[PDB]
Design an enzyme around this catalytic site. Structure first.
Site, PDB file in Angstrom:
ATOM      1  N   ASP A   1       1.135   5.008   2.065  1.00  0.00           N
ATOM      2  CA  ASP A   1       0.680   5.734   3.244  1.00  0.00           C
ATOM      3  C   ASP A   1       1.041   7.207   3.121  1.00  0.00           C
ATOM      4  O   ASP A   1       2.193   7.526   2.818  1.00  0.00           O
ATOM      5  CB  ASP A   1       1.346   5.152   4.494  1.00  0.00           C
ATOM      6  CG  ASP A   1       1.183   3.664   4.600  1.00  0.00           C
ATOM      7  OD1 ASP A   1       0.010   3.289   4.832  1.00  0.00           O
ATOM      8  OD2 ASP A   1       2.148   2.894   4.398  1.00  0.00           O
TER       9      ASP A   1
ATOM     10  N   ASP B   1       0.861  -1.171   0.000  1.00  0.00           N
ATOM     11  CA  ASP B   1       0.000   0.000   0.000  1.00  0.00           C
ATOM     12  C   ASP B   1       0.896   1.218   0.000  1.00  0.00           C
ATOM     13  O   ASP B   1       2.131   1.105   0.035  1.00  0.00           O
ATOM     14  CB  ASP B   1      -1.007   0.000   1.184  1.00  0.00           C
ATOM     15  CG  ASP B   1      -0.424   0.509   2.532  1.00  0.00           C
ATOM     16  OD1 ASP B   1       0.782   0.495   2.680  1.00  0.00           O
ATOM     17  OD2 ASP B   1      -1.165   0.912   3.504  1.00  0.00           O
TER      18      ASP B   1
ATOM     19  N   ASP C   1      -3.590   4.669   2.373  1.00  0.00           N
ATOM     20  CA  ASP C   1      -4.000   5.175   3.666  1.00  0.00           C
ATOM     21  C   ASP C   1      -3.749   6.673   3.694  1.00  0.00           C
ATOM     22  O   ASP C   1      -2.626   7.128   3.435  1.00  0.00           O
ATOM     23  CB  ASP C   1      -3.246   4.460   4.797  1.00  0.00           C
ATOM     24  CG  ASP C   1      -3.655   3.022   4.958  1.00  0.00           C
ATOM     25  OD1 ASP C   1      -4.787   2.669   4.561  1.00  0.00           O
ATOM     26  OD2 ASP C   1      -2.867   2.233   5.510  1.00  0.00           O
TER      27      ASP C   1
HETATM   28 MN   LIG Z   1      -1.006   1.453   5.126  1.00  0.00          MN
HETATM   29 MN   LIG Z   2       2.284   0.786   4.168  1.00  0.00          MN
END
Ligand SMILES: [Mn+2]
Ligand SMILES: [Mn+2]
Ligand SMILES: [Mn+2]
Ligand SMILES: [Mn+2]
Ligand SMILES: [Mn+2]
Ligand SMILES: [Mn+2]
Ligand SMILES: [Mn+2]
Ligand SMILES: [Mn+2]
Ligand SMILES: [Mn+2]
Ligand code: NA
Length: 325
Positions: free
Chosen positions: A195, A193, A249
Site C-alpha cells: 500500500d 499486497d 494499492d
Molecule cells: Mn491494500
Molecule cells: Mn496491505
DNA sequence: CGGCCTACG
DNA sequence: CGTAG
DNA sequence: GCCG
C-alpha cells in the site's frame, strides 16, 4: 484493559496466538454466514488477547476482560482444557467454510458473491474458470493471477516496488512523495499486497496525479490490471529472469488530508474501525481518511500529524507498530 | 432493542 | 456489489 | 456476540 482497540497498544508479536487464531476462525465463519456483529465481537475478543502481556493459562485470567462473554469464554476454556475447541474444528473442516475461504480470497470476490457460487454448487477455482462469463473483469484478473497473489509479499518486493512507484510519481509531478502504508508500515515482514500513499506539499498540485502515474507505469510494462484517487492494481514485478504478479494499492491525497489518509491506510483494519467508532460514539466527531468533522460546528479539524489526530480525540498516541489490533 | 467504520471504484 | 485499512 |  480498555474496551476499544484504539485505547491500548497491540504489538505485532504477542503471547496468545493459539487462542486468538481460534476466535478469528469463528469471526471469519460468522462473516461467511452474514453476521457482521458476531464477526466483530469475535474479532474484538481475539484482539484483547493480543494486547495482554502474558499467555493466558487459566480461565480465571479472562475475568473482567471486555468482549468476553459466555461464548468466547467457552472457546478459550475448551482450548485450555483440551487443546482444541470442538466448534472451531467443526468449522475448519466444513466444506462451506473451506470453500467460502477459497472463493473470498480471490481479488474481486466477497462473501455475497462467494455465497451465491456456493449455493450454485461451485466448489473449486477450476469450476469458476470453466464459467468465465459469470466473472467481472476484476474477478478475471484475480483468478488469472491467483497463484502469484497467494505468495507472500516480502520486504525485498516492497523496496523494488517503492522504487518504481517513486520513479513514476517523480516523472508525473516533481516534488510529490510516496509513503509506504498498510501492514508493512506497522512492521509486518510479509503481506498480501503493498500500500502506498502519494501527496504533494503544495495543496492542489496533486489533482489529476493518479491517472498520470498509472499511464507512466503501464507504459513501462509494470501493470497487469487496474481500474480517480484510489487504484487497486496488479503489478508485473520483475524477478531474476522472470516476474510475478503483486497487488499494489495506490492512493492520492491532498496534503491537508495526508495525516488522515496515513492514519486510515496504516490500519490495522480493526484498529481503524474501532478508532472511528470511538470518535463518533465517545467524542461526537466523525472520522474518515479525509478528515475529522465536528457535526455541531460543521468544521474540520486541521491536523499536521497523526499525533494531532490522537490528541484531538483524547487518546494516547500509538505508533504504527502498536496498532496491530 | 439495536448498533456494529466509512469511504471510493 | 467490489475494494481499502 | 457482546454491550450501551
Ligand atoms: Mn491494500
Ligand atoms: Mn496491505
Ligand atoms: Mn509482549
Ligand atoms: Mn453462543
Ligand atoms: Mn471439557
Ligand atoms: Mn476524496
Ligand atoms: Mn437484538
Ligand atoms: Mn487489509
Ligand atoms: Mn445476536
Ligand atoms: Na476477495
Amino acid at each position: 484493559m480498555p474496551a476499544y482497540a484504539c485505547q491500548r497498544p497491540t504489538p505485532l508479536t504477542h503471547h496468545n496466538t493459539g487462542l486468538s487464531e481460534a476466535l478469528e476462525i469463528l469471526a471469519e465463519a460468522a462473516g461467511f454466514e452474514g453476521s457482521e456483529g458476531r464477526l466483530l465481537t469475535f474479532c474484538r475478543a481475539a484482539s484483547v488477547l493480543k494486547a495482554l502481556p502474558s499467555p493466558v493459562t487459566t480461565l480465571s485470567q479472562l475475568q473482567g476482560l471486555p468482549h468476553f462473554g459466555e461464548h468466547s469464554s467457552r472457546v478459550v476454556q475448551e482450548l485450555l482444557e483440551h487443546g482444541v475447541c470442538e466448534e472451531v474444528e467443526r468449522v475448519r473442516r466444513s466444506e462451506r467454510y473451506q470453500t467460502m475461504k477459497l472463493f473470498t480470497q480471490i481479488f474481486g470476490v466477497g462473501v455475497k458473491t462467494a455465497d451465491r457460487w456456493y449455493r450454485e454448487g461451485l466448489r473449486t477455482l477450476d469450476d469458476l474458470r470453466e464459467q468465465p462469463q459469470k466473472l467481472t473483469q476484476q474477478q478475471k484478473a484475480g483468478l488469472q493471477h491467483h497463484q502469484d497473489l497467494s505468495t507472500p509479499v516480502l520486504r525485498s518486493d516492497v523496496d523494488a516496488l517503492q522504487q518504481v512507484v517513486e520513479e513514476a510519481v517523480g516523472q508525473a509531478l516533481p516534488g510529490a512523495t510516496v509513503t509506504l502504508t498498510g501492514g508493512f508500515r506497522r512492521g509486518k515482514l510479509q503481506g498480501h499486497d503493498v500500500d502506498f500513499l502519494i501527496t504533494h506539499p503544495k495543496e492542489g498540485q496533486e489533482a489529476g496525479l493518479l491517472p498520470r502515474v498509472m499511464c507512466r507505469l503501464q507504459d513501462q510494462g509494470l501493470i497487469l490490471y487496474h481500474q480517480f484517487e484510489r487504484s487497486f492494481c496488479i503489478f508485473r514485478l520483475p524477478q531474476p529472469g522472470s516476474w510475478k504478479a503483486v497487488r499494489v494499492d495506490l492512493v492520492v491525497a491532498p496534503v491537508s488530508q495526508f495525516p488522515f489518509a496515513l492514519l486510515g491506510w496504516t490500519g490495522s483494519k480493526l484498529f481503524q474501525r474501532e478508532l472511528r467508532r470511538f470518535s463518533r460514539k465517545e467524542k461526537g466527531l466523525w472520522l474518515n481518511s479525509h478528515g475529522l468533522f465536528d457535526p455541531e460546528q460543521k468544521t474540520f479539524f486541521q491536523a499536521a500529524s497523526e499525533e494531532d489526530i490522537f490528541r484531538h480525540l483524547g487518546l494516547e498516541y500509538l505508533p504504527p507498530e502498536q496498532r496491530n489490533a
